[PDB]
Structure formats: C-alpha cells, structure tokens
C-alpha cells in the first residue's frame, strides 16, 4: 500500500531510521550495507550556521543551483535555474569533497547494482535531499535503468529548494523516489518558512533545544514558534491565492512589498498522527497542511503547541516502531478528503485551501489533455504535413526554396503556407501562454512526444517566421530576428530538444556550441570570437536564414568569422535534420546567390564548393 | 465550481506586515498630531494623522489649475468631485511641495491613515497615481475607518484607470463612520470589511454600497467604535495560532457555497440570520463569473490566428495596389474604391476591427487578465495589425463622409487609441539604419494628417490675404511638410507614398508650385 505508491518498504524505511540514529555519531556520513541496499545517512547539525549560511546576505539562506553542475534542476523553455539553501548545499558539497571516502563508495555500490539510499533526520535529511539529486545527475539521467533508481527517506527534515526544485524533479520524473515523513506538529519542516529576521534572535536556542544534547525558555520557544507560523501564515495565504489566479492585480501590486519564503515541498510528504498515515504528492497541497495541521482548536491545546513542536522532532523513533498500526491513504488519490484532514487537525477554512490546491493540479492535467487532443488531430498534423509535402517540393522545384518563395512571392501556395504559419503560431503560443502561467502539468515540457512535435514544427516553419520578419522589415524596425524578433515559442522548443538530446551525455548545449567554434580554429583570439559570435544565428539549425539576412549584406572581412563559423556548423545540421540540403543550395536561394559572390580565395577552400556554381 | 476568495484576500492582507505596520504609523501619527514618514523593514510608511475639526461632506471638483492636478483621470462631464474639506487639507498641510522631496529615492511607499487621515492618504496616493508618467516607487494605500472620498464620477474614474486596486480600506463592522457619508459619496478601491471574527474583502463599488446598507440596517451606534481599529488590527493579525472551522450547522458540501458560508462567518453573521442572509446574497453577487482569464488569454491566441488571414489579405492587396499601373498607393485605391479588390479587402478591414475591438472590450471588462496588455505577442500583434490597416479606416472614413468632421478631430476608432497605448509597454529606441522604406508608413495616421494638410492647402488657395495666407503655411503647412520630408529622410514612410499619383506626391507638388508663387 504504502510500498506500492513509493515504491519502498517498512524495513527500508525502519533500516533508513536506524542509518539516520547512527549517522549522529559519525562525522557527516554513514554507510549502512545490507543485502541489496546501501544506505548512506548523513549527519544533523543544530547549529545556525547549518541552517542559514552567515555569508549568505539574502533574506532565506538561498542560493541559485550551478547550472553546468545540476543541469536538469531548471525551467527549460524559460531558463531559470532551481534555488536551494546555500547550507544545505555547502554541507554536502563537504560531504562530496574527494578527501572523503563518499565518492568511491557511491560509485562502489553504482558497480554492484545496489539499491542506493540517502537518508536523514533532521538538516541530514535535507543533506539527504540533495545528495539524491546530485545522484541523480551524475548517474541516473546518464543510464536510467531499474537497477539504478535511488530512494530518499527523510524525517523531520527542513525544507530544501524553491517551486523549480519541485518542479524540474517533476518533469524528470524523479519525485517518485523522494519520501519525507513528518510528524504532525514537528517545528523543524516549516522553520524554513520564515524569514531569516524573524527567527534570528531565537533561533540558536531553539536549535540547542533540538539537538538530543543536554536540555536545560518556554518563552523563547513561544515566540520562535510564533513568529514561525505567523511568516508561515503570510507564505501560506499569499501562496493559495496565487495559484489559483484570484486576484492578481491585487497580488502583483502587494508582492513588491513582501519577502516570502521561496522554500517548497520536494517529493512526497507523509503526515504522521497517532492514528493515520497520510500522503501527499502536490507541493502546493503539502505547503498549505504544514500550516494548518499545526494549528491550535483551543486555548489548552495554543498553550501546549509550541512545546510539543519541538518534543515532535524526536517522535521518529515512535514514528518507524507504529507504522503498521496507522491507517494508511493517499490524499490526492482521495475523492473525499474531509475526514482524512480532520483527523490532521485541518479546519474548514485550511480544507478549502489544501483542496484549491489539489484541485489547481487537476485542472492542469485537464489543460494538458485538451492540448494533447488538438495536437493528436489530423486537421492539425496536416498542415505541417502540407508544408513538408507540398509547399517546399513545389518552391524547390521552382528553383528558389520555400524561404525565398515566402520571402518575396505572392502565389496562392506562398499565401496559404503564410495562412498555415499563422494557425501553427496559435497552437504553440497557446502552449506556451499556458507554460508561462504554470498551467500544465511540470511533466509537459519532458514529454517526448511533445519534444519531437515542436522541433519538427520548429524545423519547418520558423524559417517561414524568418522570412515572415524580413519581407516585411521588421527586422529594420526592432533589430536582428535573433536579437528581439525571435519569438519565445521557438526557444522554448529548441531548448526542449537540446536537454532531450544532451542530458544522456551530461552536455550543456552552450558547452557543445563553443567547443565547436573552439574547433573550427578561427583566427581570432578568445574574447574577439566570443565578441563576433554574441547573438548569432548558428547556435540552432532553425536560424540559419536569420544569421544569413545579417551577413549577406556585408563586406567579406566584416563577417569572414561570422560566414566560417555558419559554413562550419552545416554539416552537422543537414545530418541532424536542422538544414535541408534540397533547400539552400538552389539557384534562387538568398543564401546561393549570396555565397557565389564571396571572393575566390573562401570560396575554393570552402567545405561547401561542391555545392554551388558561380 | 467557482472559487470564493473574499475572505482569502483579507487574509493575505492581514497577514502581510504593512497591515500592522501601516497601523503602528497611524497610531503614532495620531499620537503625535502630525504627519509621519519613516521606514519599516525597507518600506516607506507616509501616515497622516487624524482631524477631527473640518468639516465633512460637501462635493467639489477636481483642481484644473495650479500645482496640484490628476491628469490620470476623467475629464468627461460626469465630472469628478471629492470632499472639499480634504483637498483643501491636502493644500493646507502642503503634502505635495513636501512629500515631493522627502520620498525621492524611497522604493516602496505606503500612504496610510486612521479616520480623516485615511482619507486624506487616500487622495494623495490617488494623486501621486494620477500623474502621467507613474510615480518612481511603488505605491500602496491602505485606511483605517476612513470617511468615503468623492463621487461616483470619481470612483468609476479610478476603477477605468485601473487604480482601484492600489487602496485597502480596512472597515470595522460597527465603524460607523464609512458606512455614514451622504448619499453623493461612493466608495473606490478594495474594502476590507472586518469583525471580532474575521475579515472580507469586496473589491467592487457596487457589493461595498450594498454591504453599506446591509451594515446600516444592524444595530449598536456608540461612537467610539471608530476608535477601536488597533483592537482588531491586532486580533486580526494574531487568528494565525487558532484553527477556526464553520461554527453554524451545515456547512454547504459544494465547495463554492462552503466559501461564502465561511466569509459571512468571517464578518460574523449566522447564515440563519436575515442579515446573515444579505450578507451571503452580497458576497455571492460580487464575483460575476467568468472563464478564467489565465486560460482566455492563452486560447486567445487561437483567435487571433483565425482572423489573422484578414490581415494577410490587406497584405495581399497592398502588393497588389504597389504592383498596380495607376500608382495611387494602396490608401488612395481604396478610398477611391472602384474596383472589387477594394470590397474585397473592405470585408477583411471590417473582420480586423471587429476582433481588436472585442479583445479590447475584454480587456476593459476584466475577462483578459489584468497584464494582458504586457504581452510582447499582443503589443506587436495589435502594431502590424494597426500598422497595415489603419489607413484603410482613415481612407474608408474620409470616402464615406458628408464633407463630416476629420478622423483625427474625435473620429478616430478607440481601438487605435488603445493599441496606441499598448506600444509603450515595450522599448522605443533601435534605431536602425534604413536600407529602403519601411515596409509600412510608421506613423499610422500619416493620411490622416495628410488629408488635413490637404484642406488647408486649398483654403490657402482661397488666400487673399498674402500675410494670412503666411499664417496657414507658417502654423498649419509648412510644419507637416517638414514632418513628412523627415518621415521620407528616414525612410519612416512605406514605397506606397512615394507612388506618382498618390495623394502625397500630389499635395508634395501642388505645395511646391504654390511655394514658389510666394517666397
Ligand atoms: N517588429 C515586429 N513586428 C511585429 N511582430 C513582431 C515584431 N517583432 C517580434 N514580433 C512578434 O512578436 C511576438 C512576440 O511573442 P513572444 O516572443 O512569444 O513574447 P514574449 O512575451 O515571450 O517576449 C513573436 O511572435 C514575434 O514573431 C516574429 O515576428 C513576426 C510576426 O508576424 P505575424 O505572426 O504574422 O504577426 C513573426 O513572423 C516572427 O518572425
């Protein structure tokens, strides 16, 4: 039951606990063998420094991931990189150091087909989270198979990464191997949820209270645990009116004035009582009942909370020896949840929220499968095909390609494919605006299908949307098309394919691309060629036509590293798809009659001679 | 399934720290009987002290001379009225010669205020609203039991400038004050109605008068309730530590009627109760349901790509006009109007304007989200479309009228107006360097300003006076000559100006002849 929805058992979950006690003793980690599982656990701190890293001046101890190091942790199409806590991350990059034995034993335990756990209790089960997702990186996206999947079991942990960690480990499909348990009123998980100010003063003792060393002060943990949840309150208000899109004037004009916590919940959370075991996939879901499953009923109940909250950091112990006794369910799965959040101490006013936000996840699988159904239908399928199988054997056949017969023609083929262009830009837009808007599930931009969908559409068409910009000069309005005319669904799908195709490898698209300039041993130094290269169209197959607007016009030794640059990123292009050579290279083409007439010396020792005739 | 949110936004509101921080300064303003500006966590608190002398109630008109001015806002004859002891307080105090220093440089500002004071910050974040270009900090304003502020004419003015929701005016329940002002005031902005219990938040001016009279019809009236605003401030803002449920029997299982059962709990009425029971009538009819905008916005795109084959035929056909023998321009051909490919491009003219005007209306009806405007995609969407057709509604304008205002004097088409409005939500320098004329005239009411030049040009020819003559061509001639002959230098016009028998190159040659007659 609660195995099958994690896909882990109660003996790995009580081996986990029993790591997670050991890891105390040790320094930074300890390793647990047995049987087909390695364990690796990782030691708690409770000191401030371990939870907001002194050097860090932001408002939460937050830090960007490294991109070249965590490359899946990001929006795709958008960019933006995943946020965690700068402690948490600097901890396990300690723990990671190659002066330590961790790094072989990973790859010890990787050689022999183990199950590999991380685990943790307390800040350790935050280390826990991170080291998953560094796994994750180094070994999983390179050879995903059964074998190598890992688990990550947490306890009380705080939490780690904003809404784009929990978003990039959706659309990896990672999450599935993330469980964090939870006692009902542990402090620890929503500490994070305010802001460093509020709990500086009170913090360190508070820590000392939590640390299992030598308890010896009800008002300081009344007023941490307050002013806790009174940051949690705001974080949690502002949060569900949000998602669900209510009153967003309102919203974007109060949020310049507030500072909220950007930590969210990563992977399942299970909820503990005396009587129940309750989990929980949605983040947002999650984030709401970590405030009001905290909350008071009545004044004999306010005057216990705080005490309580952090006597429940330690009912782990409790937690592990009971499961088999609780009532187990699946929240989301549930088609009646009242019970279930009554019995988590949930009122009416949280009911509704936690439900908002499940129900706001409903709506975007219900969004993602109106957009499967129009882009699965043939009158739509149809109009690439008719560009692929009619407009551009007809303008080839023609003698000038289809770029240049949209470009300057006005048939009623060359019309037609401009009608096609446009409804085209409509479906994708629409998908795009509903990206942008977090409406659609955080799998969508993974998905294959779609992968292979956009970048044949973004093969075919946004050449017509080059020829589109510069028959109509639009590029003499508002600049090169690949400065500010490109338009954002075409990045979007081009990044989609490049992490599609590069992720296996451990490849960044950027990496890729100058290596190869770094190849072509052009005769500029470094800064010159990166100089030359800034805002270029040979970073994508698909803008061939735009750098080729921007350099036809111009004196050879102006461009001459711009032209070898394009001639030497071809090749590869026309292999992979990106370029078609029955296109190009006609007589009509602006590209042919443009290349004809660069000065013999280039021309001769081109890679493309056999191509063309003077 | 709708979702109720009155009550959610006054909970985020409550719970954020200028609710108790615009509070703290209100209280110490009051104390102190003088205005005071200071920081709190890096926020600007400006918070104006309560005056208990003047005299409240009498309707006056917005300032149309002097240093003080809304520009912002409606000049349209319902005209905009506010109470005349508040302005004259905001001139008495000297807020704008002094704020105007004290907050350069600030980047996050509240204006806040108890009672007249709350009025008060009211007009003066209105007016710091109202300016044309918006203020260099952002601005929020939120009051405490503050009397209403000005007229209908008023409220409807910031609701169509889009400022309402720049004010919280926070209302105890048994605050008599705002519930209290003579029946010319209306409310504007968001009122956070609030209880020993709770709080909801009405956005719309309509719900809040209803809730007015609701509230008018309950029954404790001592004073003094006005003065109790740090009292619920401070409960509001602590409810975060107690799990509060429904407290009647049933609570309504569809989640939509659960909501409003909650918020009339909230502002502490049973739903069994007759006011309890306009109360839930009030919540229910502020909404007006809609599609969501997030999803409207985006399926738009569907839309705008069905009519955009419109636009590509005014393409076609200005090709075509360029292509053409005669050398009219495709402006002149159309307005000339002989020919079929002119009814036919006539059909898409009218499908374009048919589809902005209602993505505008939309847009002013709130079913397109409130940042919709902001969107590269609509900003350079609504620019093609403007730049290619606009000419056709001027030419189709002045061939069908009675010689019958012009188009530029009150007969120009809102939608252009507002597209006009659009572009500034993106860059305006690159200037790049021209290679030919662009592919359509940039300013998209040349013609109309052409056919203006064109009838002063004849009246002109009319003459007599050879120093009046003088005064058409130094004031009403020769600087449109100039503005053209630098839109043509840059190369800012379209090829089809520039075609013989356009009505340009007419004017252009009539103009130089007549140049030529007289120095
Ligand atoms: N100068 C100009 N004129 C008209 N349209 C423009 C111009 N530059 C760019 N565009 C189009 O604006 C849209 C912006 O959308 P997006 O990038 O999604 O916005 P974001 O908010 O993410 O920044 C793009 O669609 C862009 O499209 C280019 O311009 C042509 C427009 O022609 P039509 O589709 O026929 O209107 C397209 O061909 C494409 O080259």
Request: proline share 4%; with cysteine; net charge neutral.
């Given at each position: 039951?609660?195995?099958?929805?994690?896909?882990?058992?109660?003996?790995?979950?009580?081996?986990?606990?029993?790591?997670?006690?050991?890891?105390?003793?040790?320094?930074?980690?300890?390793?647990?063998?047995?049987?087909?599982?390695?364990?690796?656990?990782?030691?708690?701190?409770?000191?401030?420094?371990?939870?907001?890293?002194?050097?860090?001046?932001?408002?939460?101890?937050?830090?960007?991931?490294?991109?070249?190091?965590?490359?899946?942790?990001?929006?795709?199409?958008?960019?933006?990189?995943?946020?965690?806590?700068?402690?948490?991350?600097?901890?396990?990059?300690?723990?990671?150091?190659?002066?330590?034995?961790?790094?072989?034993?990973?790859?010890?335990?990787?050689?022999?087909?183990?199950?590999?756990?991380?685990?943790?209790?307390?800040?350790?089960?935050?280390?826990?989270?991170?080291?998953?997702?560094?796994?994750?990186?180094?070994?999983?996206?390179?050879?995903?198979?059964?074998?190598?999947?890992?688990?990550?079991?947490?306890?009380?942990?705080?939490?780690?990464?904003?809404?784009?960690?929990?978003?990039?480990?959706?659309?990896?499909?990672?999450?599935?191997?993330?469980?964090?348990?939870?006692?009902?009123?542990?402090?620890?998980?929503?500490?994070?949820?305010?802001?460093?100010?509020?709990?500086?003063?009170?913090?360190?003792?508070?820590?000392?209270?939590?640390?299992?060393?030598?308890?010896?002060?009800?008002?300081?943990?009344?007023?941490?645990?307050?002013?806790?949840?009174?940051?949690?309150?705001?974080?949690?208000?502002?949060?569900?009116?949000?998602?669900?899109?209510?009153?967003?004037?309102?919203?974007?004009?109060?949020?310049?004035?507030?500072?909220?916590?950007?930590?969210?919940?990563?992977?399942?959370?299970?909820?503990?009582?005396?009587?129940?075991?309750?989990?929980?996939?949605?983040?947002?879901?999650?984030?709401?009942?970590?405030?009001?499953?905290?909350?008071?009923?009545?004044?004999?109940?306010?005057?216990?909370?705080?005490?309580?909250?952090?006597?429940?950091?330690?009912?782990?112990?409790?937690?592990?020896?009971?499961?088999?006794?609780?009532?187990?369910?699946?929240?989301?799965?549930?088609?009646?949840?009242?019970?279930?959040?009554?019995?988590?101490?949930?009122?009416?006013?949280?009911?509704?929220?936690?439900?908002?936000?499940?129900?706001?996840?409903?709506?975007?699988?219900?969004?993602?499968?109106?957009?499967?159904?129009?882009?699965?239908?043939?009158?739509?399928?149809?109009?690439?095909?008719?560009?692929?199988?009619?407009?551009?054997?007809?303008?080839?056949?023609?003698?000038?390609?289809?770029?240049?017969?949209?470009?300057?023609?006005?048939?009623?083929?060359?019309?037609?494919?401009?009608?096609?262009?446009?409804?085209?830009?409509?479906?994708?837009?629409?998908?795009?605006?509903?990206?942008?808007?977090?409406?659609?599930?955080?799998?969508?931009?993974?998905?294959?299908?779609?992968?292979?969908?956009?970048?044949?559409?973004?093969?075919?068409?946004?050449?017509?949307?080059?020829?589109?910009?510069?028959?109509?000069?639009?590029?003499?309005?508002?600049?090169?098309?690949?400065?500010?005319?490109?338009?954002?669904?075409?990045?979007?799908?081009?990044?989609?394919?490049?992490?599609?195709?590069?992720?296996?490898?451990?490849?960044?698209?950027?990496?890729?691309?100058?290596?190869?300039?770094?190849?072509?041993?052009?005769?500029?130094?470094?800064?010159?060629?990166?100089?030359?290269?800034?805002?270029?169209?040979?970073?994508?197959?698909?803008?061939?036509?735009?750098?080729?607007?921007?350099?036809?016009?111009?004196?050879?030794?102006?461009?001459?590293?711009?032209?070898?640059?394009?001639?030497?990123?071809?090749?590869?292009?026309?292999?992979?798809?990106?370029?078609?050579?029955?296109?190009?290279?006609?007589?009509?083409?602006?590209?042919?009659?443009?290349?004809?007439?660069?000065?013999?010396?280039?021309?001769?020792?081109?890679?493309?001679?056999?191509?063309?005739?003077? | 399934?709708?979702?109720?949110?009155?009550?959610?936004?006054?909970?985020?509101?409550?719970?954020?720290?200028?609710?108790?921080?615009?509070?703290?300064?209100?209280?110490?303003?009051?104390?102190?009987?003088?205005?005071?500006?200071?920081?709190?966590?890096?926020?600007?608190?400006?918070?104006?002290?309560?005056?208990?002398?003047?005299?409240?109630?009498?309707?006056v008109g917005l300032p149309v001379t002097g240093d003080v001015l809304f520009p912002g806002l409606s000049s349209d004859?319902?005209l905009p009225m506010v109470?005349?002891?508040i302005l004259?307080?905001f001139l008495?105090?000297?807020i704008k010669?002094?704020?105007?220093?004290?907050?350069?440089?600030?980047?996050?500002?509240?204006?806040?205020?108890?009672?007249?004071?709350?009025?008060?910050?009211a007009f003066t974040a209105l007016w710091l609203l109202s300016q044309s270009s918006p203020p260099?900090?952002?601005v929020?304003?939120?009051?405490?039991?503050?009397?209403?502020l000005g007229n209908?004419s008023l409220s409807?003015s910031i609701?169509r400038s889009?400022l309402?929701?720049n004010?919280?005016?926070?209302?105890?329940?048994?605050?008599?004050?705002?519930?209290?002002?003579?029946?010319?005031?209306?409310?504007f902005?968001?009122?956070?109605?609030?209880?020993?219990?709770?709080?909801?938040?009405?956005?719309?001016?309509?719900?809040?008068?209803?809730?007015?009279?609701?509230?008018?019809?309950?029954?404790?009236?001592?004073?003094?309730?006005?003065?109790?605003?740090?009292?619920?401030?401070?409960?509001?803002?602590?409810?975060?530590?107690?799990?509060?449920?429904?407290?009647?029997?049933?609570?309504?299982?569809?989640?939509?009627?659960?909501?409003?059962?909650?918020?009339?709990?909230?502002?502490?009425?049973?739903?069994?109760?007759?006011?309890?029971?306009?109360?839930?009538?009030?919540?229910?009819?502020?909404?007006?349901?809609?599609?969501?905008?997030?999803?409207?916005?985006?399926?738009?795109?569907?839309?705008?790509?069905?009519?955009?084959?419109?636009?590509?035929?005014?393409?076609?056909?200005?090709?075509?006009?360029?292509?053409?023998?005669?050398?009219?321009?495709?402006?002149?051909?159309?307005?000339?109007?002989?020919?079929?490919?002119?009814?036919?491009?006539?059909?898409?003219?009218?499908?374009?304007?048919?589809?902005?005007?209602?993505?505008?209306?939309?847009?002013?009806?709130?079913?397109?989200?409130?940042?919709?405007?902001?969107?590269?995609?609509?900003?350079?969407?609504?620019?093609?479309?403007?730049?290619?057709?606009?000419?056709?509604?001027?030419?189709?304008?002045?061939?069908?009228?009675?010689?019958?205002?012009?188009?530029?004097?009150?007969?120009?088409?809102?939608?252009?107006?507002?597209?006009?409005?659009?572009?500034?939500?993106?860059?305006?320098?690159?200037?790049?360097?021209?290679?030919?004329?662009?592919?359509?005239?940039?300013?998209?009411?040349?013609?109309?300003?052409?056919?203006?030049?064109?009838?002063?040009?004849?009246?002109?020819?009319?003459?007599?006076?050879?120093?009046?003559?003088?005064?058409?061509?130094?004031?009403?001639?020769?600087?449109?000559?100039?503005?053209?002959?630098?839109?043509?230098?840059?190369?800012?016009?379209?090829?089809?100006?520039?075609?013989?028998?356009?009505?340009?190159?007419?004017?252009?040659?009539?103009?130089?002849?007549?140049?030529?007659?007289?120095?």
């Amino acid at each position: 039951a609660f195995e099958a929805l994690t896909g882990i058992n109660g003996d790995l979950i009580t081996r986990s606990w029993s790591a997670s006690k050991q890891a105390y003793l040790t320094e930074r980690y300890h390793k647990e063998e047995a049987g087909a599982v390695v364990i690796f656990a990782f030691q708690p701190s409770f000191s401030e420094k371990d939870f907001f890293d002194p050097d860090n001046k932001s408002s939460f101890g937050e830090i960007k991931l490294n991109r070249v190091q965590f490359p899946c942790m990001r929006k795709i199409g958008k960019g933006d990189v995943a946020t965690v806590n700068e402690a948490f991350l600097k901890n396990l990059e300690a723990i990671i150091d190659p002066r330590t034995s961790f790094q072989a034993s990973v790859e010890m335990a990787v050689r022999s087909r183990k199950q590999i756990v991380f685990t943790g209790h307390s800040s350790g089960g935050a280390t826990a989270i991170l080291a998953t997702v560094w796994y994750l990186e180094k070994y999983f996206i390179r050879n995903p198979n059964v074998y190598l999947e890992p688990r990550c079991v947490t306890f009380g942990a705080p939490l780690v990464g904003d809404s784009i960690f929990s978003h990039a480990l959706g659309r990896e499909k990672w999450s599935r191997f993330f469980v964090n348990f939870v006692s009902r009123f542990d402090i620890v998980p929503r500490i994070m949820l305010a802001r460093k100010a509020s709990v500086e003063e009170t913090l360190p003792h508070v820590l000392a209270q939590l640390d299992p060393r030598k308890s010896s002060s009800e008002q300081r943990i009344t007023e941490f645990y307050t002013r806790v949840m009174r940051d949690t309150s705001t974080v949690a208000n502002q949060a569900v009116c949000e998602l669900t899109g209510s009153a967003e004037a309102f919203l974007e004009t109060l949020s310049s004035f507030l500072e909220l916590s950007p930590y969210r919940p990563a992977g399942t959370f299970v909820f503990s009582t005396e009587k129940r075991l309750v989990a929980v996939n949605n983040s947002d879901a999650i984030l709401q009942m970590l405030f009001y499953t905290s909350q008071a009923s009545d004044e004999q109940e306010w005057s216990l909370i705080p005490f309580r909250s952090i006597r429940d950091h330690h009912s782990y112990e409790e937690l592990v020896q009971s499961m088999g006794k609780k009532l187990f369910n699946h929240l989301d799965g549930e088609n009646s949840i009242e019970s279930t959040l009554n019995d988590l101490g949930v009122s009416t006013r949280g009911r509704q929220y936690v439900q908002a936000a499940l129900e706001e996840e409903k709506k975007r699988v219900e969004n993602q499968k109106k957009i499967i159904q129009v882009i699965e239908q043939e009158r739509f399928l149809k109009k690439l095909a008719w560009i692929e199988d009619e407009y551009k054997p007809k303008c080839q056949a023609h003698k000038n390609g289809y770029y240049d017969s949209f470009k300057v023609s006005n048939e009623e083929n060359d019309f037609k494919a401009n009608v096609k262009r446009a409804e085209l830009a409509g479906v994708f837009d629409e998908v795009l605006g509903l990206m942008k808007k977090c409406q659609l599930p955080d799998e969508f931009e993974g998905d294959i299908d779609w992968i292979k969908l956009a970048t044949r559409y973004r093969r075919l068409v946004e050449p017509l949307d080059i020829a589109n910009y510069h028959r109509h000069l639009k590029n003499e309005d508002t600049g090169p098309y690949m400065k500010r005319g490109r338009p954002t669904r075409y990045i979007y799908a081009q990044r989609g394919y490049e992490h599609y195709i590069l992720k296996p490898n451990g490849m960044i698209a950027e990496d890729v691309f100058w290596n190869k300039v770094n190849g072509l041993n052009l005769g500029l130094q470094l800064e010159e060629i990166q100089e030359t290269l800034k805002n270029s169209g040979s970073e994508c197959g698909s803008c061939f036509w735009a750098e080729v607007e921007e350099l036809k016009g111009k004196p050879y030794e102006e461009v001459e590293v711009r032209v070898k640059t394009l001639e030497g990123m071809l090749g590869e292009w026309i292999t992979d798809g990106e370029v078609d050579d029955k296109e190009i290279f006609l007589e009509g083409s602006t590209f042919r009659k443009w290349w004809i007439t660069l000065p013999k010396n280039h021309k001769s020792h081109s890679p493309l001679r056999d191509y063309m005739m003077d | 399934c709708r979702f109720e949110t009155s009550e959610l936004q006054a909970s985020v509101m409550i719970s954020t720290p200028l609710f108790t921080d615009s509070w703290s300064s209100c209280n110490t303003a009051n104390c102190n009987g003088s205005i005071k500006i200071h920081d709190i966590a890096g926020i600007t608190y400006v918070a104006i002290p309560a005056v208990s002398m003047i005299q409240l109630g009498n309707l006056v008109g917005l300032p149309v001379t002097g240093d003080v001015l809304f520009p912002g806002l409606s000049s349209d004859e319902p005209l905009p009225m506010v109470d005349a002891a508040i302005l004259k307080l905001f001139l008495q105090l000297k807020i704008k010669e002094g704020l105007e220093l004290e907050l350069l440089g600030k980047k996050l500002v509240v204006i806040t205020g108890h009672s007249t004071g709350g009025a008060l910050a009211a007009f003066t974040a209105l007016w710091l609203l109202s300016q044309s270009s918006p203020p260099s900090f952002r601005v929020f304003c939120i009051t405490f039991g503050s009397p209403l502020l000005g007229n209908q004419s008023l409220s409807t003015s910031i609701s169509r400038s889009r400022l309402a929701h720049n004010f919280c005016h926070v209302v105890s329940i048994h605050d008599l004050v705002p519930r209290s002002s003579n029946e010319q005031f209306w409310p504007f902005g968001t009122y956070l109605f609030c209880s020993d219990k709770g709080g909801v938040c009405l956005d719309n001016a309509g719900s809040v008068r209803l809730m007015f009279n609701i509230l008018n019809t309950t029954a404790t009236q001592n004073t003094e309730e006005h003065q109790r605003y740090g009292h619920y401030v401070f409960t509001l803002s602590h409810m975060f530590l107690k799990s509060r449920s429904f407290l009647g029997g049933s609570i309504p299982d569809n989640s939509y009627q659960a909501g409003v059962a909650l918020a009339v709990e909230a502002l502490g009425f049973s739903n069994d109760d007759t006011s309890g029971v306009l109360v839930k009538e009030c919540i229910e009819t502020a909404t007006r349901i809609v599609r969501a905008p997030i999803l409207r916005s985006a399926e738009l795109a569907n839309e705008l790509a069905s009519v955009l084959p419109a636009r590509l035929e005014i393409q076609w056909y200005k090709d075509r006009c360029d292509a053409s023998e005669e050398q009219l321009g495709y402006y002149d051909f159309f307005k000339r109007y002989s020919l079929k490919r002119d009814f036919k491009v006539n059909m898409s003219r009218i499908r374009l304007a048919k589809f902005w005007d209602t993505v505008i209306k939309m847009v002013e009806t709130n079913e397109l989200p409130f940042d919709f405007h902001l969107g590269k995609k609509w900003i350079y969407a609504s620019q093609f479309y403007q730049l290619l057709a606009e000419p056709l509604d001027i030419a189709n304008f002045y061939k069908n009228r009675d010689i019958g205002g012009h188009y530029l004097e009150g007969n120009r088409p809102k939608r252009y107006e507002v597209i006009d409005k659009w572009q500034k939500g993106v860059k305006v320098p690159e200037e790049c360097v021209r290679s030919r004329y662009a592919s359509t005239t940039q300013d998209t009411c040349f013609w109309a300003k052409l056919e203006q030049a064109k009838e002063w040009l004849d009246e002109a020819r009319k003459e007599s006076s050879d120093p009046q003559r003088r005064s058409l061509l130094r004031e009403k001639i020769v600087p449109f000559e100039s503005y053209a002959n630098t839109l043509v230098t840059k190369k800012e016009v379209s090829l089809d100006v520039k075609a013989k028998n356009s009505s340009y190159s007419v004017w252009e040659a009539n103009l130089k002849e007549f140049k030529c007659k007289m120095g």
